[PDB]
Write a protein that binds this ligand. Sequence first.
Ligand SMILES: *Cc1c(COP(=O)(O)O)cnc(C)c1O
Ligand SMILES: *Cc1c(COP(=O)(O)O)cnc(C)c1O
Ligand SMILES: [Cl-]
Ligand SMILES: [Cl-]
Lengths: 502, 502
Amino acid sequence: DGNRLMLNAGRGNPNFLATTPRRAFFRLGLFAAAESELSYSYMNTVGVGGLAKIEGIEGRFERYIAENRDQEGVRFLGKSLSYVRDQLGLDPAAFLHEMVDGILGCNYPVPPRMLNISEKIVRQYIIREMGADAIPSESVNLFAVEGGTAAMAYIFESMKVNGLLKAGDKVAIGMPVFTPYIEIPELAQYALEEVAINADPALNWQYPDSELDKLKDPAIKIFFCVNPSNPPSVKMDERSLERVRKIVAEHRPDLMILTDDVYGTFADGFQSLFAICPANTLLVYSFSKYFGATGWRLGVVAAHKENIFDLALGRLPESEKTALDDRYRSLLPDVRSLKFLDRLVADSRAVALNHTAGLSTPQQVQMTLFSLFALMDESDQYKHTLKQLIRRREATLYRELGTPPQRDENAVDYYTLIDLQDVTSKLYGEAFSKWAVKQSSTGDMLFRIADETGIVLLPGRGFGSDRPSGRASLANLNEYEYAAIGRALRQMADELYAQYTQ
Amino acid sequence: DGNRLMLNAGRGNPNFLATTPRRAFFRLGLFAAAESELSYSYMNTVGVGGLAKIEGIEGRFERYIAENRDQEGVRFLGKSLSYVRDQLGLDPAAFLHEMVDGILGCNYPVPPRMLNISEKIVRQYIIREMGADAIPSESVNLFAVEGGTAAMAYIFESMKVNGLLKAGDKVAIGMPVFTPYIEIPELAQYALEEVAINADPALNWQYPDSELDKLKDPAIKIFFCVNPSNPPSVKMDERSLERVRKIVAEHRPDLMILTDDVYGTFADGFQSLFAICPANTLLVYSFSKYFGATGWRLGVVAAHKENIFDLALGRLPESEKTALDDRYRSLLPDVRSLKFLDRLVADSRAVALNHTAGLSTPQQVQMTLFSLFALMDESDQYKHTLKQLIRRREATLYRELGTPPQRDENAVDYYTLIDLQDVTSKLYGEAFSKWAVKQSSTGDMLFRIADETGIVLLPGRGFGSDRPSGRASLANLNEYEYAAIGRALRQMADELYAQYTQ
Ligand SMILES: *Cc1c(COP(=O)(O)O)cnc(C)c1O
Ligand SMILES: *Cc1c(COP(=O)(O)O)cnc(C)c1O
Ligand SMILES: [Cl-]
Ligand SMILES: [Cl-]
């Protein structure tokens, strides 16, 4: 399943996971279960509870924390309350009841877009990790969704439905990008045309100015990028972000930006395009990778309250405004005041079902607890732990290839590129590396590792020339498995060197 | 004492008792004791507490419930709060403080008639078990008293004092009734005249229309009945209740009804005369039999807020109104607005002591807890348990007499009639049963059982012919004792059959 996921979906699945916010969730659940039972009125039954009451919830919660000081999840829950009440200044009783009611999953999400306090908490996390601090928190709204996967499906459908993207429109795509994102515009369902914004291996996988300038073409309605990138696993540098900023400000104030920033926390000092061009950007952030929460399906779509999506909607042709008046008629009297972010919500479940739309309340609670976990960790201990783990696995991989590729300030390294030439160069000089590349390819490299270790790697391209290389995730295997990849690739190189000399 | 009670008082005393509401009471007491100690200010003393404080009582109570989840009485107390707050919509803090203050018995009952929340709770129980659901709860008021025993004493005295019953007035009494109720009107203290409303054995102890029509006599001021009956142990059927209803509506809107419905819960789908004619009826309900609480002395008098007792009081001759103005002068400025139900309270302790009158607060608390116990038991598990117990004891009794009398929909069976003829008929045919009755009587039947088993039974009459029969309570003995009664009565029948044949 780990090997099959990389081939099919270009992921990625970590073998680590955040335990403390998970324990806090299950412990909160036991508290909420007791809260439900406090509202059950009848004798001689079993298995039926009532709704949790907001009245006196703080005092009951405080007792629960005091009696269970020995439980890690409970201590976390205790500090979470302080963080929300004391640092965020939010209503403590309202926070607790939203969490209790939320984890019970006994009420339809209200509002459907996101639960009130969860939105306020999660956006603090999002703003911080995206480097978007210069934007007032109150100007950022979130739509809680079933991972980045759901976000992308919802966004393209709403773009189509609301006439923001039309058949024949050009979508610029920062490349190399993983397979799934190439196909969605290529669907006849959308019939969009791709323009490649190509990263340069000579610039260490940054986008050249010349490539970024392609965005000046007014036929290009949207810039779509994974940042930090996947496969290449680098973050857009200061120059690149500035270039986009100037292009938007100077030439294309109408350019929509769709940015997928799931790997952000794995970079040093990450800054999102959302931070740089908030009015022009829809941010997709997934909790999957950082918290080891792929199965939880936790994501948000973020939008600035003043954005070009709502501006474009006000500039639509009359026939389209009339069609949308009909579409959203049941939702509100004035459809023209219905914002794009809330249209995403309505479009996600056929409009008529808007009031039972949204991410499940226990999922939002869990998302909120992951968010708190990271926010309360001021010295970034969890982040550093994961980074040290990733570096250890890297050292182990390149042990006999030695050693790892040199990493700059823009490095992410969730993924690593094992380049045959660079490896054979490090081992046996420049002359040998030129020859070794002409002998074997990516196929012979990936098939050998697979046969020796049972691990299949991603080809390392490209698009390029088929420079013989493979990509491994530093997130999904254990040390001896990275050591076995290195050993198999070292024997392959050693046998090439014995076929070099003689 | 069990045998002596049936002979003297026509009871009845169960050998079962409701344990859960009793455990809840004692557990509540320990909580209240701690509440009292929280208000004690001084050092180096022992055995002195203060008054329980309403402030923060919910939170303290909730902690008490959480720490003692393993205690049956405490779990019941926890669910009681939910029932009162959530299902009845009453003030939870006020409920708790009434219960805490109540069980401490540290304040005179206020108001004297009944404690406020206890009245609201207990009437829900009363209305449900009496089948009086069609009457709005707010239109039913209760006077908490020391069992049905105190109720009857109080009611007759107030009837006399307030001129509603006068010497020479006729009291109709549904018969057979147990001894105590025959004597109270016969007292020179009241000098009332009895009219027998006779139940018909041919109608399975229902009152014939012809007997019920006796109520048309305007000299009959009150209909007094035990329903379900005692001794006969049947409930008034649909026809009988309708007959009384029409008689009251058509001929006697002035007829007072006094109904004693202690056995109600032992019938299937019981409906009280209070439900049928609320404006005309004073309901006496005792908790003694159903909860096995004879020693607790727990009863209520129930009255509709719009009733013929207050109507009659407004129609009294001027000399009587003047006398009552003097009597109740200290109570309120306008004595003519003092309702009959509150007159019962004032008459119970000599008027001048009205403000220290009423049932003890711990008794009312216990009554409230019995009421909750039954209200919260939606599937009527306790009721069914008692009924199955009663049926088992019946099967055991008639095992060798076999088998029990056929029971119709109006059957109660707390008591059972052991008819010699019917028993000997079931065993040895109709011819033998006619002869066996002419040989032995009720005396020879009751004296034989007494000598063989040590149990004395009630004669089974009548008034009738002395058809040789005995009444046993199915509530007061254990299985082997019922088996010994059956065996003694079977040998008596077998020796009669050996004196038949030869
Ligand atoms: C793993 C990954 C995601 C996260 O997907 P979810 O559906 O949120 O689990 C998003 N984008 C890219 C490019 C990824 O590699
Ligand atoms: C047992 C019984 C009662 C109950 O008497 P308390 O004084 O309430 O215990 C009332 N009426 C009748 C006919 C009974 O047999
Ligand atoms: Cl835990
Ligand atoms: Cl107990």
